[PDB]
Each structure stands twice: as structure tokens, then as C-alpha cells.
Structure 1
């Protein structure tokens, strides 16, 4: 990124080092990129990338027989550099992903197969997800939205560094209704104590998904406050994570929530599907059910939707009838100031202070007129 084309004569790069790390710095300047691996490499005859690859072609209906499988193996990048394929096919058979009809040896997708493909889910993750859902449908808590959120809470990657001492403090202060959900999932208070007392991550044993469970329940709490319209600064102080890690999490959970919804629909689990089908939109914007209609407008996010709701505008229909200058004023009240704000400067009438995507700078007035204009266009398309 050193050197602007058409602007600079040269691009300069400086790597600051010490005498001790002097040799490692030179290694980088002379270093070159490593050769590209296939990521489908084989004491592991089976592998995730291959299992998914084989599942996609069989369920999709472009690979039926055993001859089609090895023909596919020829097209891979792994074979370009110049058994394992057969192992993945059996794996799909053992775990009810694929069917075999002896037309000798022809493979067809199951309901679980077609569901996994439509859900864009990884076959390795689908097994635990399928069990987790069946476990939840045997005993489910409906008095709050926490248990539902847990099912759509992603835990395939760490989104933040969790302070366990902070976690235990929230555990005790946690209401009884949410402790019931914790117990029902696997959250044991004993494991939480062995985390604060001693910084033993363990996780060496495969059976230590016990760690992931507590990380997942911690995350669901964050997502619970998030769709409860709890301020980002409160969530930051309460949990110990920045706004960057949160936004990356909600956009991840919004997508994941859609996956579990599709997965539940293709298996015929209507009751479970019915509950989940409202959280994709709520996780995206971080809102409650009431603001779901307002946030259809492009410029209206969580903060702008709430202040317009609390001012009499509950729906797009109510927002189309709106007086523009009234919308503008309500927007002006949602701004965050360090001092308890909420002189006359008439030189700020042209200040473009509202950002969009692929944006021209919008004034607070122009944005308001756009919100009312868009609301009317949507109101007509609703008929």
C-alpha cells in the first residue's frame, strides 16, 4: 500500500526493529509467499472440505453413481498437483445424510441431506445442531427470548475475549427465569467457578465442548440485550467488549438465524421454525418487534426507529403521512452528546451530517424528506 499510482514518485516502506529482532526483519524483506495448499489434503482419511464437497454434488443431483464421484476427484485442485473419496461417501451414509440403492450403487439425498444443502450449513456442524434442536424441543422455555436466541447463537469462532470474573458476577445477578435456561442447556455453576478461580482453558480434550457451551450462553446474553435495545455503551461496560466485536457478532447471528430457520423448515419442524423466523430481522438491526415495520425504510436504523416510535410514528403508514420538518426534529433529538444536550447557528443549514452506503452527504433535512418519500413509495408497494 506504499505508492499512489499517478501521485507519488516512489513508495517507501520502513520496518522498525531492534538488534535482537534484526534477523527476523530481513527474513520478511527477502521472504516470498508459500505455495498454495489444497485444503482437501488427507491420519485423516476423511476431511470436512471433502465431505461438504461430496454432499453438494449428490444432493444437488449432478453426481449419482460411484463413477461420477471419482470423475469429480479429477477436477479438484488436489488432483492437479499430480481412496479418500470413498471414505466420505460412507460417512454420509453412516450419518443419514445420503441413501444407497443397490443400477448398482446409486446415491440419493435424504431429507437431512437436502436440508443441509438448503441451509448452507457444514455437514460436520449439522450433526451437533440437529441434536441440539431435538434436545430443545423436548423441553423449551418460552417465557423469555433467551432460549430461542441460544439456538441461533453462533459459536464456530471467538468474537471476543471473555472476562470470566465479569461473567460470574452477571451469573449471580441473573434472574431465575434465565438461570433455568442456563441449566437446561449445560451451563454448570461449578465450571464457571473453575474459570474465574483458575485461568485453565483446557480445551485439549474433544469432549471439552463444555467450554463452547459457556461461551455460547455468554454470547446469547449479549444478543438478548442487543435485541432489547440496550445501548452499545452499556453492553460494552457490562460484558467487556467493544462495539466492533458486537456488530461483527450480530451480522453473523442474523445470517446464522436464517440458516437454522431454513433447516427447520425443510425437516418439517413447523413449531420450531415459527419461533425462529422472527429473530433474523431483530438480530440484524438490534430492535424489538415493534420497530420491525419502521426499519424497512433504508435510512431508519435501531436508534432512529425508536425515537420515531416514541413520538407517534409506529408504522410506515404513519410515517408516510408525516410532516417532513417534524421527522427532521425527532431525528435531531436522537443525537448523542457528551454533555446533557438532548446559540443559534444558521450556517449549519448545509452541513452534510448523515452518512449512507454509496453515499452523498445528506443534511438532516434532506434525510428526513428521503425517509418520508421512501415511506410513501413503500406504502404503495404494500397494496
Structure 2
């Protein structure tokens, strides 16, 4: 029965599973795969805890369908991190049968067009983008299957409502062609009260189970007392350690199980709070070792390899990590460089680290199981802790093979107790659409996009079809205004020129501003703020410097950071007129910055909303300029107050926004603006090729400078030590694009001073000085390397 070898897998995949793990399925998996019609081809929704073999029940369906029918699966995952991990995992299983597995995730994408793949594993908005493009190609018939994780995100508005739109399009196009399942939807979720509604919407079969291989003792600590689920008072605890201001004994709650050689995962409200607790915990591991209780075992021979591997990173070994990592204490949050996450994840996954204070980043996207989970408060960011967040936090408790029973302890004040009791006793709110109009309110951005994305694809081009599409949404299940809201959208789309009216009844056609908003996969709420920037550049584009191209290209964010408007006003005042003119043409204005330094965010009329959206995008441009200007990432974080983890997210985004907005300007037909961006797409790439890595040892070589030496002479630093200073000076003078020292007639001097100060090679040296000093540096580097 449960032994997987009986299920008829091809031996290569069976042997790969035998290598990867258990040969026998859990009983719930055998039931769920033996519902009456899921194997026939009917859609499915199911739920199991994250500790269960959740994805196996999809993988065996994928393996069957892609082998039994020569059609292409589309595996939709909530985050790039889990998408990358699942890509490599699934590649390892199927590759010996010849299934081509590749993914759309972050900046990475398949080296071949979708028609060559067999299983595309991708993030949600990559999948919706691919669905839009499959519609534009009308090649949708290729799509065999959609596998959806976290289907309970149907109601999440920041991201997730895309899952309504995406599944609705597949239903509608199937129903449009209908009026043996063409596209099977397999939807994985946490258990919901109305899960059978989602299953009924998807016409799906249903399974859900409480089964988990490792059981969880949930609890709330209040005072000394620990209450089990159903508030059974199982235990009282007394402080094994006495610590100044550890009024909750949070260190002792760690130490108690550290005495048992078991690890602790400690979720906190914020990054600052994680650093403070990783500091405090490491100080007590130090004190216990210094005042030398049971002994503490560390295997520091391994921690020195981890901590040296951190020292190699251009971040440097962070001042907190210097203190904590030697003791097996770490911290983990999205302020860390991706490599620092992967190092600290790996060190905790092997258990070299024993305590890891973390934000929600270890709740979603990072599967670090632990014996004991702790949640430092019921309040997060002044919210009550979300019930979905809590039940995803505690799902980390228990380690499959290393441990027998999982433990979790919420820490709660006596006055807060009702909130903790609610978190344990409560259950997830019923999932409900974002399409639903609130009774008296303006129609929602999810509905506006949901209507635009069919019209622009040439699907449901007449309004009677739009009512037929609305009847496919999950909203049309949640209600059992449904007609009147649709014609309130087309008014908004018409009066913003996303679509055109045509008589005969009527037919609606996409404008270029339609096709651009669709095929760049921007949101309609963004392409107004982008178009008001792109079109205003057509009226006067500064070509002598990058800042205006960066303002068009820089990612849209709201509150990318807390912004110091006063330092931004001090910064804007300092800009060169070469660049301050770009601020004027963009519309940055002293009358607006003066308000934003003097007072609150302006009340948002459409004018004041636009003028606010301009400045936050400009501030993000000045950061993004400094990144390409090779200003030290240590300096940038002083200058703008962001931190190194945000910068890598900005680098990841700006490299993509250059690509989107090129397609946006292409679809508008503004080909003369496209080329000015399609060239800049070559320069938003921040990692050097190995060509310069030797030359980059020379302190006077910016990569922009090493670029011309290697292009001119293939130089090894030995060659730069051999080179004649006169040849370097001429190579330097033939490196920079020509910019006069001459003042032209009716110029202001500041506009040419900034042409002169832009040619000195650091302010900085003149080339006659630099070309001597760089040969003297190179010959010193050479003799230091040869010894």
C-alpha cells in the first residue's frame, strides 16, 4: 500500500526518491491521491501542515500527468527563495527521465522559450505574466496543469489576488472554449473554514487533515505559568537564570532546552529587537562559560570556518556576529545580505548555531525547523499578531528526523493574556476576494485590473462577455452589484484611455497604453504614475548624464525606507546643476520639499498625490545613482539611512524595471525613448566579470577605470607595473567621453565647472598625476605579490 514502489513510478524517479528519503507515504497521502476523480483529472484542493509531506501529493500528480499526457505543467510558488529550492529539487528527480525543468524567478529565467520546457516552476507574478503572454500568443492550449501553493492567499491584497485573476482566466478560457479536464488545478493551502467553498469554486475534490509526523505542544506562557491548548495548566516555570531585565525569563526559556542540547527559534517584532536578544543571549552563554550548571558544547572548530566565511564577504563580519557566532548564537532578518542569510541558514540547519532570533523572514520562504519555537510578543508592529502568521511561525516547531516532539511557547503579559488565548483558540478568517466592492465605495483596483487583463488579451471584447467573465471569479462564489461594478470599471478604463469605445451594442479595444500595461505586467495603478513620468520626459530629456534615465527606470516603491526628508532637502540643494536641472524637469520643487521637511505627508488631492509620488521616486533615484557610481555601500547607508539588505532588493528590482519600462516604451511606439533605455539596461548590472578582478586590486582603479586598461592592454598588474606612465596617461585621456573645459557663449560657469570637475580622476587627480601614481601603485602591488 504505502510503499511507494508499488505505485508504478519509473525506477529512476523511485531510486531518486529512495535516495532523497522515506520509501513509504503517510496514510493521508494515499487517501488524498485515491479520491475518486483527482487521478481521472478533476481539479483538487487539499490541506496539510507544512511539516507533512505536502508537496509530494502534487509532485506525483505532475509526474503522472506530464508522462501520461505530453502537455506542460506550470508550478506556482509564493516566493523566489522557495521557487529556486523547488526548481533544483524537482530537476534532480525528473531529469533522468528527460523532463526539462526551469523557472521564472527574480532575475533568473529559462535560457529557452516556454515551448521548450516541460515543467515551469515560477513565482505568482511570473506565472500571471506567462499566462498573459500565452493568451497573446494564443498558445494557451499548451498549458496542461497549474499547481498552486498557499491558495489561501486568494484574499491577500498586497500580493495574492493575482491568484484570483490567474485561475479565473484559465477557467474562463476553458469555459469560453467549452461553451478530460483541459487544465487541472491542484491547490495547496492551510486549512480554512470555507475551504469547501474554494474547492467548489474550482469544481475540485477536497481533502484536509490534521496529521503531522511530529506533534506540537502549543502553549502560552503567562507569568510563571504555562497553559496548554484548551488552557490546561500543564506547567509552571521558575527562572533557571537571573538576568537584569529578563522579566519574561526569555533567556532561561532558551537555556532550559540548551541544557538539553536543543535549539531555539525566537521570533521578534523587529530587526532591532532580534539584534538585542541575540546580543543578550550570547552574553549569558559567555557568562555561563566565563563564570564556570551543565556544560555548553559548541564544536567551535566548525564555527571558526563559518565565521571566517563571513569575514570573506564584502559586508565584513558584522559587529554583532563577531560577538554572537562564536557562542553558536546568531540572528537572521532581511537586513542581511543574501549570502549572510544563506550562511546563517546553513549554520543553523547543521545546528552549529543554536539560537536564531529572527523576524517573520523565517516564517515564510525559509524552512528552518527547530525543536522549540518562541514568539516574543503577541503584538507585532502595533498590530495583533495575525492568526495566519502565528500558525506559520509555530509550524517550524519539531525536526522530522532529529526530534520526537515539537515544542512552542508564546510569551505573553498578564494583561495581554486574552490576545494569546485568542491566537491559540482562534482559526483563520474565511478567505474572501479582493474583487468585492465595498457597498458604498469606489470599485477596487483588483477588479479594474481583472477586467483590463482580458480586454487587452483580445478575450471577452464585448461587455456581455465581461459579465460572463465576472461570473467565473471566486467573488461570484463568495456572494452565494455583481453586474453594475463591471460597467463602473470600463468607465474608469475609458476615462483614463486604457481602452477605446467602438460602436457595434459596443466593442472595446485596447490602446497602446492598454497593451503596455498588460505586457509589461505593471499594475494599472502604477502605469499612471509611470506614464506621467515617461511622457513628461519626452518634453525634455537630459542626455548628458544618467540621472534622468535612472528616474525613468528606478523602481516604484512606497516607503522603500523611512525617508529623512530634511537630509533629502540638504542633498538636493547640493546637487550639481548638471543634475539639479533634471530635478527641475522631473518636477522636484523647493515648495514641496519645504513642506515635507516642515510637516506631515500632504493631504492627497490628485495633484498632491502625483507630486508626492515624484519625490519618493527621485529619492530612490539618487540612491540608485550612487550604486552605479561605485560609491561604497558602507557610505551609501550613511548617506540615505537604508541598509545593505534593502540595497540588494533595489539592485534586484532596478535591473528588472529597466526591462519592463523598455517594453512599456516599445508598446507605446516611443521607439526613440526605448533606445535611450535599452542601452541603459546594459549598465544596470552591478557584478563584475573576472576580467578585472586582478586589476581591481589597484586602489586607483574603479571598475570603470580597470575596464579601459583591460580593454586597451589586457594588462595583468605586472603589465601595469611595466607600462610607461605616458601610455597610461594617453589611455586615460582616450578613455573618458569628450567633455569640454571650454566655456561656450552664454553658458553659466557652473555648467562648465561641473564638466571640468567631472573629468578629474579621484575632486581628484589630473591624469598626469594619476598615470604616475597608478604605475607606482602597480609596481608596489607586483613586488608585494611576488614575495
Q: TM-score, normalised by structure 2?
A: 0.37
The equivalent position to 1:136 in structure 2, one of 526, 529, 537, is: 537
Query: What is the CA distance between 1:76 and its match in structure 2?
Result: 0.1
Q: Is the alpha carbon distance of 1:371 and 1:248 closer, same or farther for their aligned partners in structure 2, counting shifts above 3 Å?
A: farther
Distance 1:378 1:165, change over 3 A: closer
Greater Cα offset, 282-291 or 211-220? 282-291
- Going from structure 1 to structure 2, the CA distance change for 1:375 and 1:5 (only over 3 Å counts) comes to farther
Task: Write out per-residue CA displacement over residues 123-169 of structure 1, whole angstroms, 9 at most, x where no aligned residue.
Answer: 23223322322211111211211011111122343221112232233
**What is the CA-CA distance between 1:338 and the residue it aligns to?**
38
Quick one: distance in 1 between partners of 2:453 and 2:545? 37
Show the counterpart of 1:286.
687
Is the deviation greater in 133-142 or in 292-301?
292-301
- After superposition, the Cα gap between the structure-2 partners of 1:27 and 1:257, relative to the gap in structure 1 and judged at 3 Å, is same
Query: Could you list the per-position Cα deviations for residues 161-195 of structure 1 after superposition, in whole angstroms to 9, with x for gaps in the alignment?
Result: 11223223322322121111112222122332333
How far residue 266 of structure 1 moved from its aligned partner, in angstroms, is 1.4
Between the aligned partners of 1:119 and 1:275, the Cα distance in structure 2 is 18
* Change beyond 3 A, Cα 1:328–1:131: closer
Change (3 A) 1:334 1:184: closer
In the alignment, the residues of structure 2 paired with residue 13 and residue 341 of structure 1 have an alpha-carbon distance, to the nearest angstrom, of: 72
* Preserved contact between residue 291 and residue 314 of structure 1 (Cα < 8 Å): no
Does the Cα contact within 8 Å between 1:282 and 1:289 map onto a contact in 2? no
C-alpha distance in 1, partners of 2:741/2:405?
50
Residue aligned with 2:478, SS = coil
Cα distance in 1 for partners of 2:569, 2:759 equals 45
What is the deviation of 1:30? 1.7
Residue 374 of structure 1 is matched in structure 2 by 777
Write out per-residue CA displacement over residues 236-295 of structure 1, whole angstroms, 9 at most, x where no aligned residue: 112111011111122222222212111111122111111111333433436799999999
**Any conservation in 2 of the 1:227–1:288 contact (CA below 8 Å)?**
no
1:4 aligns with one of 399, 405, 412? 399
The CA deviation string for residues 90-135 of structure 1, in whole angstroms up to 9 with x for no partner, is 3222322223332532222222222222111222322332232221
Return closer, same or farther for 1:374/1:8 CA change in 2, 3 Å cut-off: farther
Distance 1:376 1:54 in 2: 67
Distance 1:377 1:275 in 2: 42
Distance 2:509 2:773 in 1: 52
Bigger shift: residues 19-28 or 30-39: 19-28
| Structure 1 stretch displaced more, 81-90 or 37-46 | 37-46
Moved more, 225-234 or 328-337: 328-337
Segment drifting more, 240-249 vs 342-351 = 342-351
1:320 aligns with 2:721: yes
- Cα drift, residue 212 of structure 1: 2.6
Give yes or no for contact 2:721–2:779 (8 Å, CA) kept in 1. yes
Q: Distance in 2 between matches of 1:285 and 1:52?
A: 34
Q: Which residue of 1 aligns with 2:755?
A: 348
Q: Deviations over 1:293-341 (max 9, x none)?
A: 9999999998999799599659999999999999999999999999999
Contact 2:455 2:461 in 1 (8 A): yes
Worse overlay, 336-345 or 8-17: 336-345
Question: In structure 2, what is the Cα distance between the partners aligned to 1:338 and 1:88?
Answer: 52
* Pairing 1:31–2:438 present: no
User: Shift of the alpha carbon at 1:88?
Assistant: 1.3
TM-score of the pair, normalised by structure 1: 0.72
Larger Rg: 2
C-alpha displacement of 1:13: 1.0
Aligned length: 379
- CA distances 1:217-238 after superposition (whole Å, capped 9, x unpaired): 1110111111122221121112
Distance between the aligned counterparts of 2:491 and 2:780, measured in 1? 54
SS at match of 2:700: coil
In 2 relative to 1, CA 9–239 (structure 1 residues): closer, same or farther, beyond 3 Å?
same
Kept after mapping to 2: 8 A contact 1:99/1:107 = yes
Superposed CA deviations along residues 340-379 of structure 1, whole A, max 9, x for unmatched, are 9999999999999999xxxx99999999999999999999
C-alpha distance in 2 between matches for 1:76 and 1:199: 40
Q: Mean Cα displacement is larger for which, 307-316 or 32-41?
A: 307-316
Q: Which has the higher mean CA deviation after the structures are superposed, 299-308 or 154-163? A: 299-308
Aligned residues of 2:462 and 2:507 also touching (Cα < 8 A): yes
Q: After alignment, is 323-332 or 286-295 more displaced? A: 323-332
> CA 1:69–1:348 in structure 2 vs 1: closer, same or farther (change >3 Å)?
closer
CA–CA distance in 2 between the matches of 1:111 and 1:141?
25
Inter-partner Cα distance in structure 1 for 2:527 and 2:649: 23
Query: For the Cα contact (< 8 Å) 2:717–2:782, is it kept in 1?
Result: yes
Q: Distance in 2 between matches of 1:62 and 1:381?
A: 69
**C-alpha separation between the residues in 1 aligned to 2:516 and 2:494?**
15
3-state SS in 2 of match to 1:275: helix
Richer in strand (by share): 2
Q: Is the 1:46–1:88 Cα contact (8 Å) retained in structure 2?
A: yes
What CA distance in whole angstroms lies between the structure 2 residues aligned with 1:371 and 1:381? 15
Q: Which runs of 5+ in 1 are unaligned?
A: none
Give 1:202-241 correspondences, 5 Å limit: 207-241=608-642
Does 295-304 or 150-159 show the bigger shift? 295-304
- Matched residue of 2:400: which SS? coil
